[PDB]
Amino acid sequence: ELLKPRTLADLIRILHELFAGDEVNVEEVQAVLEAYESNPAEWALYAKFDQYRYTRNLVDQGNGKFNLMILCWGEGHGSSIHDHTDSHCFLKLLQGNLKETLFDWPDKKSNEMIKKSERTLRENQCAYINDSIGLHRVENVSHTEPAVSLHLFSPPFDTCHAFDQRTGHKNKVTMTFHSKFGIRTP
Numbered sequence: 254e255l256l257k258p259r260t261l262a263d264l265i266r267i268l269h270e271l272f273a274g275d276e277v278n279v280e281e282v283q284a285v286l287e288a289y290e291s292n293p294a295e296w297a298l299y300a301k302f303d304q305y306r307y308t309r310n311l312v313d314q315g316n317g318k319f320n321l322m323i324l325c326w327g328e329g330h331g332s333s334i335h336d337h338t339d340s341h342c343f344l345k346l347l348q349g350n351l352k353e354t355l356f357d358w359p360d361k362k363s364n365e366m367i368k369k370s371e372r373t374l375r376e377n378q379c380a381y382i383n384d385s386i387g388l389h390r391v392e393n394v395s396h397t398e399p400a401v402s403l404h405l406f407s408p409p410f411d412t413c414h415a416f417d418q419r420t421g422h423k424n425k426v427t428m429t430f431h432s433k434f435g436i437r438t439p
């Protein structure tokens with residue numbers, strides 16, 4: 254039974270229930286993420302920014318079956334075009350706006366990766382992607398407002414591929430945590 258999360262802690266508790274089994278009800282998870290009304294005081298601890306690029310801040314390690322983290326995007330910070338390593342990815346805006354650009358998987362042939370579509374993800378909205386849907390880039394295109402997003406990955410993963418927009422060629426990247434549980438982890 255899906256109830257509105259009252260706080261971030263409540264959301265985390267609910268997520269542990271939703272991931273108690275071996276499969277994932279994407280629509281339910283997305284709905285509960287969307288239903289949590291971002292409260293900055295509840296996640297300030299995790300919102301550790303870097304001047305030069307976006308940061309990944311681990312919030313909860315889940316039950317073995319998911320990673321929950323907060324990404325902090327300075328003005329103009331964005332990601333690579335990337336996949337999600339055969340995992341579910343939920344992305345909920347906690348502050349600001351992010352531009353999500355969707356791309357198809359490239360062919361073997363070297364070619365420009367042409368965007369399929371783009372959209373603006375707004376505060377409190379929750380997006381979803383998986384490799385069956387495609388690839389994406391996520392960007393804070395604002396010149397004046399930092400963005401903060403809450404990402405849930407299931408299963409957890411710490412590597413993915415970045416794709417060269419000019420060719421479709423991919424390279425494996427290991428993701429690093431800027432902090433874990435509020436503690437900076439150099």
Ligand SMILES: [Fe+3]
Pocket residue numbers: 335336337342389391
């Ligand atoms: Fe992503």
